[PDB]
Amino acid sequence: IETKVSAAKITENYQFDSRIRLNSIGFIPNHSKKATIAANCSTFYVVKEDGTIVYTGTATSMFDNDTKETVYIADFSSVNEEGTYYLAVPGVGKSVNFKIAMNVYEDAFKTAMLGMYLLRCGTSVSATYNGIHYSHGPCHTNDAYLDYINGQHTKKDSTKGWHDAGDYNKYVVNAGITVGSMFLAWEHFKDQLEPVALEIPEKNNSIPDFLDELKYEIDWILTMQYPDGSGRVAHKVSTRNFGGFIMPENEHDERFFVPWSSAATADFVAMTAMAARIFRPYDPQYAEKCINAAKVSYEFLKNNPANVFANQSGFSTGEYATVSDADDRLWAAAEMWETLGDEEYLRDFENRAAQFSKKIEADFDWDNVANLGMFTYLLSERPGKNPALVQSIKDSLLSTADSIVRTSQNHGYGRTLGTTYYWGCNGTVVRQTMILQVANKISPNNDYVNAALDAISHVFGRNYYNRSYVTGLGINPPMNPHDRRSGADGIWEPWPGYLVGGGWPGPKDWVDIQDSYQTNEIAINWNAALIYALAGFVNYN
Ligand SMILES: [Ca+2]
Ligand SMILES: [Ca+2]
Ligand SMILES: [Ca+2]
Ligand SMILES: [Zn+2]
């Protein structure tokens, strides 16, 4: 007997069907919620796990130019009541269960941060995730020799930091966009991130956990300044060739400092200038050490304007040879100015900024970090900015954010990067949230926040594969990443919390096999983009 308050309940029993693709983690109340159904259909129900039909709708068809298929879009954004639901599509089947909650992304954020902790070098790491224990002993404790720097086969401490990707070498240019992304997440969402506790050794000190993780990397970056006091910064610490699939503590080859590059030197300045202002409130002494190092390398750069590529002929590991250091130098000037305030730094930034035709780029990564410099300058509360330059950057930013909104709204799976695929493009999909969040800070628009959620949803299930691209999370995540710890331990499931690079050159080119470093590797710059994307939705209201 049904009363006047009994709610409608699903009649038939549905089976999971891979053609119903959506964010496998969940949605936030008051934001878009969409699913892409790769099957002909019309009616769909959003059902609570108890069988209660909460919403009935009809899917609308749309041609996915990317995969060249007609797909059906189920929009259930109106459902805003917290709970666990699933999508039931008569004739197709049902989706995985997902949650609608204000804090739906917090575990994902903590897991992506756990990913960074597990990438630590020079120390033993240990974590239990979903009941499986991941750990490894102290590794690369003898970094690194000066042979290629000065000639002496002597050791200068260069331990700590994070292994870069599937390999264990540490590269400065890639640490640039990584550290920059994560420090910008802290500056943009400080109030949301400060109280977050992570599973790290430093959980019991006086520094916000998010910053302890970044400190592990900055501690390493500081050791990269040449020992001659010239201010030049070594490009990377690396073995001569890529080692094999072994645990890091078993890699005994000697690691060397590789000759400097101007880009690495400019990135060093930007990273340590940011660290100086961000750590000052917590460890003033550490901040002083950072700003002094930044000043030495900046003086060098100021006197040697040429773009210089690192001499790394004897090495066969990652190159990270950014074609230009103009963007890196622009970023360094913006960070020195924001931290210090001197007119000298502001003048340097503005002179370089004017030389950029398009102030903001929708597609950016380790090679083009100008956006980071534009972001710091644009949001700075310091006086003195040339109002014409500000308006120029602002227009470019909003114009770019609008383009990304239009792209995701017209993509059959809400992909912000549209039809563009290339090595590491999954990282860029979520890195685009930086543009959207900054645009939202300058000119509030919920289209910007929803597009950011589209980028996040794309990576967690609303994609052609109906798979999460992050190990240990969501639906059918990567099982075989090109990752040495994963390929060499005795555990079935790979190490958790990593966004894989992604397929290319096409939408269906991702392959989840260990040999595919082209589409299935992990990397700090990809995880940093994911961390920034999720950060804005931690302790969110
Ligand atoms: Ca702490
Ligand atoms: Ca560059
Ligand atoms: Ca394994
Ligand atoms: Zn290591």
From Swiss-Prot:
Outcome of swapping D327A: 86% of wild-type activity
EC numbers: 3.2.1.4
Pfam families assigned to the protein according to its UniProt record, in alphabetical order: CelD_N, Dockerin_1, Glyco_hydro_9
Statement: the UniProt record of this protein carries the keyword Hydrolase: yes
Listed result of changing H411S: 32% of wild-type activity
Cofactor(s) required for function per UniProt: Ca(2+)
General function of this protein: This enzyme catalyzes the endohydrolysis of 1,4-beta-glucosidic linkages in cellulose, lichenin and cereal beta-D-glucans.
Protein name: Endoglucanase D
Organism per entry: Acetivibrio thermocellus
